[PDB]
Structure 1
Amino acid sequence: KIMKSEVLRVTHELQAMKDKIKENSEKIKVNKTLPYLVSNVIELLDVDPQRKGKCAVIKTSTRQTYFLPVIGLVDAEKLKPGDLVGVNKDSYLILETLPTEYDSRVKAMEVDERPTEQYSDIGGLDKQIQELVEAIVLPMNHKEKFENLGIQPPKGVLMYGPPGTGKTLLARACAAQTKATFLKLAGPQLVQMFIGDGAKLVRDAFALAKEKAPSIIFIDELDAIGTKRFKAGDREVQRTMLELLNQLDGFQPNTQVKVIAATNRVDILDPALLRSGRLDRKIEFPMPNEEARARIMQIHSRKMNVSPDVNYEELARCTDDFNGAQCKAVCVEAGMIALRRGATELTHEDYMEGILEVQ
């Protein structure tokens, strides 16, 4: 072991390095304390002919352009043309780069942490919603098994069906089970007065989904803008829409946060919406029958003082060709006039009274 006795000197040199890094590593806090302004960064690779070529183009907020090479600490997500970077007083170095995404009108579209309703509020849809509950639970907790089996979850799910079916509140009810950040988005929000806004809205959605933590982005009324016209505004929605499809077709690192979509009608079905990353999950959600409407109305009305003498035959007969949110409006209306009816217990005539009241 006489040859291995020189390792002690090496360990003393290494622990001496750990003892001497406290000062030069300690000045990091006083030199990198606070970047006082914000400057935009534009990446431009240079060539010196070590003597290697590496530079970048800087733009300050006060419209002043300067010169500086790519410097700072170890960069992994950096080197992108972004803003909100660290800079000292006048030397103009890059110390702390953080993405900005400002235009809060699109950033703070729907800031929802988590909803209140859950998946246990409906009745008679487990045979078709269980695939979605799996498709949102197993891709969140079973990422470890995705390498043993080589499975990549789909990013486009088509939640299509007739309107008024409560698909929005049901997908949100599953978003409560996702436990991630819920972010709504409306179809008619892409159509703006100025040009090129849809690119900023789409790249903003993938800026918060790509940049931010694992979240949930549910959109609705996509059929209202998914028109395949052959000037025209829906062709501009073909520029923004086909741009989004290009970001769901040309991006292999799109294994991040999913994009859930729902269409209230399948009359104008875009044929280009068929792909593993695109809207491949096509589970048909028809109009619930009087049995299913009595189920979702019973579980949605399990909190009010409902009379126990309900055979569901009269309401099952009156509810003809109705939808989910319509029976939800009947439940809410019954909870509205049942107060002024004097009797605190919900009666049986209030069902047809609400049906003929709002419809």
Structure 2
Amino acid sequence: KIMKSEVLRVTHELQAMKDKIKENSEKIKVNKTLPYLVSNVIELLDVDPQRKGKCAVIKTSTRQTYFLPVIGLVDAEKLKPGDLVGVNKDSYLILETLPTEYDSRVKAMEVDERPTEQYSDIGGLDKQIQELVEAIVLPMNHKEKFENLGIQPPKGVLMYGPPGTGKTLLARACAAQTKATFLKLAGPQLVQMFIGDGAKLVRDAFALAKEKAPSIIFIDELDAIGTKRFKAGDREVQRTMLELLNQLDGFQPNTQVKVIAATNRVDILDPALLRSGRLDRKIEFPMPNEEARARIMQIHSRKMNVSPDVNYEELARCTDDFNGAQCKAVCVEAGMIALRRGATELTHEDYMEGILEVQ
């Protein structure tokens, strides 16, 4: 062991390095304390002919352009044309880069932490919603098993069906089970007055989904803008829409946060929406029958003082060709006039009274 006796000197040199890094690593707090302003960064690779070529183009908020190479600490998500970077008074070096927003009108579209309703609020849809509950639970907790089996969850699920069925409050009810950040987005929001806004909205959606923590982005009314016209505004929505499909087709690292979509009608079906990353999960959600409407209306009305003498035959007969949110409006209306009816207990005539009231 005489040859291994020199390792002690090496360990003393290494622990001496750990003893001497406290000062030069301690000045990181006083030099990198606070970037006083915000400056935009534009990446531009240079060539010096080590003597290697590496540079970047800087633009300050006060419209002043300077010169500086690519510097700082170990960069992994950096080197992109972003904003909100670290900068000193006049040295103009890059110390702390963090991606920034602005145009808060799109950043704060729907800031929801978690909803209140859960999946146990409906009745008679487990045979078709269980695939989605699995498709949101197993890709969140069973990421370890995805390497033994080599499974990548799909990113596009088509939640299509007739309107009024509750395709938004139910997907939100499953978003309560996702436990991730919920972020809504409307179809018509892409149609703006200025040019090129849809690119900023799409790259913003993948900017918060790509940059932020694992979240949930549910969109709706996609059919209202998914028109395949052959000037035209829906062809501009083909520029933005086909741009989004290009970001769901040309991006293999799209294994991150999913993009859930829902269409209120499948009349104008875009044929280019078929792909593993695109809307491949096509589970048909038809109009609930009087039995299913009595189930979702019973579980949605399990909180009000409902009379126990309900055979569901009269309401089952009156509810003809109705939807889920329509019976939800009947439940809410019953909870509205049942107050002014004097009797604190919900009666049986209030069902048809609400059906003929709002419809």
TM-score (ref. length: structure 1): 1.00
In 2, Cα distance between equivalents of 1:15 and 1:220:
59
In 1, Cα distance between equivalents of 2:259 and 2:189:
16
Aligned to 1:155: 155
3-state SS of the aligned residue for 2:185? strand
In 2, Cα distance between equivalents of 1:313 and 1:175:
34
Aligned to 1:64: 64
Aligned to 1:269: 269
In 1, Cα distance between equivalents of 2:24 and 2:348:
79
In 1, Cα distance between equivalents of 2:7 and 2:245:
59
The worse-fitting range, judged by mean Cα deviation, of 1-10 and 286-295 is 1-10
Q: CA deviation at 1:304?
A: 0.2
Deviations 1:154-213 (A, max 9, x none): 000000000000110000000000000000000110000000000000000000000000
Deviations 1:116-137 (A, max 9, x none): 0000000000000000000000
3-state SS of the aligned residue for 1:41? strand
Contact 1:161/1:284, CA 8 A, preserved across alignment: yes
In 2, Cα distance between equivalents of 1:253 and 1:101:
22
3-state SS of the aligned residue for 2:47? coil
Q: CA deviation at 1:19?
A: 0.5
Aligned to 1:338: 338
Contact 1:42/1:82, CA 8 A, preserved across alignment: yes
Q: CA deviation at 1:278?
A: 0.3
In 2, Cα distance between equivalents of 1:331 and 1:296:
10
Contact 1:101/1:207, CA 8 A, preserved across alignment: no
Q: CA deviation at 1:227?
A: 0.4
Q: CA deviation at 1:65?
A: 0.6
In 2, Cα distance between equivalents of 1:252 and 1:316:
49
Contact 1:36/1:88, CA 8 A, preserved across alignment: yes
Q: CA deviation at 1:283?
A: 0.2
Contact 1:185/1:220, CA 8 A, preserved across alignment: yes
Deviations 1:306-345 (A, max 9, x none): 0000000000000000000000000000000000000000
Aligned to 2:49: 49
In 2, Cα distance between equivalents of 1:355 and 1:62:
61
Deviations 1:250-285 (A, max 9, x none): 000000000000000000000000000000000000
Pairs within 5 Å for 1:163-178 = 163-178=163-178
Contact 1:273/1:279, CA 8 A, preserved across alignment: yes
Pairs within 5 Å for 1:230-309 = 230-309=230-309
3-state SS of the aligned residue for 2:255? coil
In 1, Cα distance between equivalents of 2:100 and 2:354:
50
Pairs within 5 Å for 1:221-232 = 221-232=221-232
In 1, Cα distance between equivalents of 2:226 and 2:48:
50
Q: CA deviation at 1:4?
A: 0.8
Contact 1:101/1:208, CA 8 A, preserved across alignment: no
Deviations 1:292-316 (A, max 9, x none): 0000000000000000000000000
3-state SS of the aligned residue for 2:253? coil
In 2, Cα distance between equivalents of 1:325 and 1:245:
31
Q: CA deviation at 1:145?
A: 0.2
Contact 1:273/1:280, CA 8 A, preserved across alignment: yes
In 2, Cα distance between equivalents of 1:321 and 1:306:
24
Deviations 1:70-93 (A, max 9, x none): 111111111111110001110111
Q: CA deviation at 1:94?
A: 0.5
Q: CA deviation at 1:224?
A: 0.4
Q: How many residues align?
A: 359
Deviations 1:23-47 (A, max 9, x none): 1100000010000011111111111
Structure 1 runs of 4+ aligned residues shifted over 4 Å read: none
In 1, Cα distance between equivalents of 2:130 and 2:3:
66
In 2, Cα distance between equivalents of 1:220 and 1:73:
42
In 1, Cα distance between equivalents of 2:220 and 2:258:
15
Aligned to 2:113: 113
Contact 1:85/1:94, CA 8 A, preserved across alignment: yes
3-state SS of the aligned residue for 1:167? coil
3-state SS of the aligned residue for 1:102? coil
Q: Where does the alignment leave 5 or more consecutive residues of structure 2 unmatched?
A: none
Contact 1:182/1:218, CA 8 A, preserved across alignment: yes
In 1, Cα distance between equivalents of 2:9 and 2:201:
60
Q: Where does the alignment leave 5 or more consecutive residues of structure 1 unmatched?
A: none
Q: CA deviation at 1:101?
A: 2.8
